[PDB]
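Closing statement on the UR2 sub-project.
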Amino acid sequence: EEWYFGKITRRESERLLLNPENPRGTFLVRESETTKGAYCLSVSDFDNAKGLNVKHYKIRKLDSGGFYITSRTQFSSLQQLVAYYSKHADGLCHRLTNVCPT
Ligand SMILES: CN(CCCC1CCCCC1)C(=O)[C@H](CCC(=O)O)NC(=O)N(CC(=O)O)Cc1ccc(OP(=O)(O)O)cc1
């Protein structure tokens, strides 16, 4: 749905995400530019060394089966992946909050 930005670049996704109006955990999903066949979760975060920043998480997919950031926490679809990380961070920088406007 709405959060799937497709073939958007890393840099453009960082420019969209970095808007100060975006709360922590504003996100998108896109393709990986560098890993082909893979996806990325791009997430806004904040620390006080750097302020506003973005984290990117590689999404992989085992061949005949699950989508994953870490290999024991798998999901059958990208939908399930994102719906999970919106309930809990589970190791992520932040829980997923806002879909990115863009
Ligand atoms: C899968 N994990 C490892 C950690 C996963 C956690 C999840 C919670 C539970 C415990 C394990 C990653 O993905 C990490 C996540 C953030 C981080 O740990 O810092 N990110 C990463 O390794 N990056 C590469 C780098 O630093 O070289 C950043 C990056 C840059 C461009 C990009 O985009 P693209 O794919 O289009 O090139 C995609 C990624």
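Strands lie at 4-6, 27-31, 39-47, 51-61, 67-68, 74-75. With this model delivered, the sub-project is considered complete and its resources will be redirected to Aim 3.
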